[PDB]
């Protein structure tokens, strides 16, 4: 099966994937409304990471990865499509390359119901919080930069108003 | 986290593991009571694969694998310890090497409640069914041989009465 990576997976490429395609999905928008206490932040001082939200006019550029078929032959691992703030569903992924027809992919999403969801907030604020945060995975700012730098390698900044704006405010903070 | 492989994982080594240790666990016994329709058998002509059953006098030799920390920084993947015929729990794993202290490991088990559970049966029968079966993964007999040959590389045949007996009956069938 193929899964869509709208975040860290884009650049955190050290995992096993049979194949990958740059592309985009629809009807969702990428927002930094997901709190991070185990990666780019910690409890008591959470960081912000991305999640996808339903947006009819929405688009999200990212990368689709083909997971290797599982080795354990004794149990049937399953997919639960429902589940406690994290959603699993599928959506159409459009490859950047027109040579490939669009195909279904798995989407793993953290909902408004997940415990870590921080929700929408003024960008001024999100940027600062990101500025300050650091977690087991690294600093919050590095996460944003990679993503942003990461997306730019694939599309014009117009593609993600929210992400690039954030990057810019942060860079400004880094100034003063 | 570390997971215990009592089956195919022992020899199907083409996956990513940070580390591995030969060892054994207790209070469970390995039996060929699990039906296979997606690996070593198919619907309408199922094969047999191993599952672990609670056995107070029981022991299971196998290998423990250290899974790599997950790359996705956006969602919290969880462990559900309860779940529809497959159980997830932990048990003590004793390394063959005394230099290492015993440690907890994850055990993923298919219960009597799973749909594919075929249950106990006369060994004469299981061997034949295995003889005949083939699935997406390969023939049923190859699965048994690898396991058996696989275990022997780690312990005397006395360790697994059930597995080696089965191997032998099968080899006999292969004769006539």
Author numbering:
A (entry chain A), B (entry chain A): 1 to 82, 84 to 177
Task: Pull text from the paper.
Recently, two isoform enzymes, ChaC1 and ChaC2, belonging to the γ-glutamylcyclotransferase (GGCT) family have drawn attention due to their ability to cleave the γ-glutamyl group of glutathione, resulting in 5-l-oxoproline and cysteinyl-glycine (Cys-Gly), specifically in the cytosol. ChaC2 exhibits a 10- to 20-fold lower catalytic efficiency than ChaC1 and is constitutively expressed and involved in the “housekeeping” GSH metabolism. Despite their low sequence identities, GGCT-fold enzymes exhibit a similar structural fold for their catalysis, including a YGSL motif and a typical catalytic Glu residue, as well as unique features, especially in the vicinity of the active site, which specifies the substrate repertoire.
With the native ChaC2 crystal structure at a higher resolution (2.3 Å), we were able to finally determine that these electron densities came from the loop region (residues Val60–Asp80) of the adjacent ChaC2 molecule. The ChaC2 structure exhibited a mixed α/β topology with nine β-strands (β1–β9), three α-helices (α1–α3), and two 310-helices (η1 and η2). The ChaC2 structure exhibited a unique flexible conformation with loop2 (residues Val60–Asp80), flipping out from the core domain. In each ChaC2 molecule in ASU, the long flexible loop2 protruded from the center crystallographic trimer and formed an unprecedented dimer with the adjacent ChaC2 molecule, which we call an open conformation. When the structure of the crystallographic ChaC2 dimer with flexible loop2 was superimposed with the structurally similar enzymes, the Glu74 residue in loop2 of ChaC2 was found to be located at the dimer interface and structurally equi-positional to other active-site Glu residues in the structurally similar enzymes. However, ChaC2 adopted a unique quaternary structure wherein two ChaC2 monomers exchanged their loop1 and loop2 structures, resulting in a more flexible and open active site cavity.
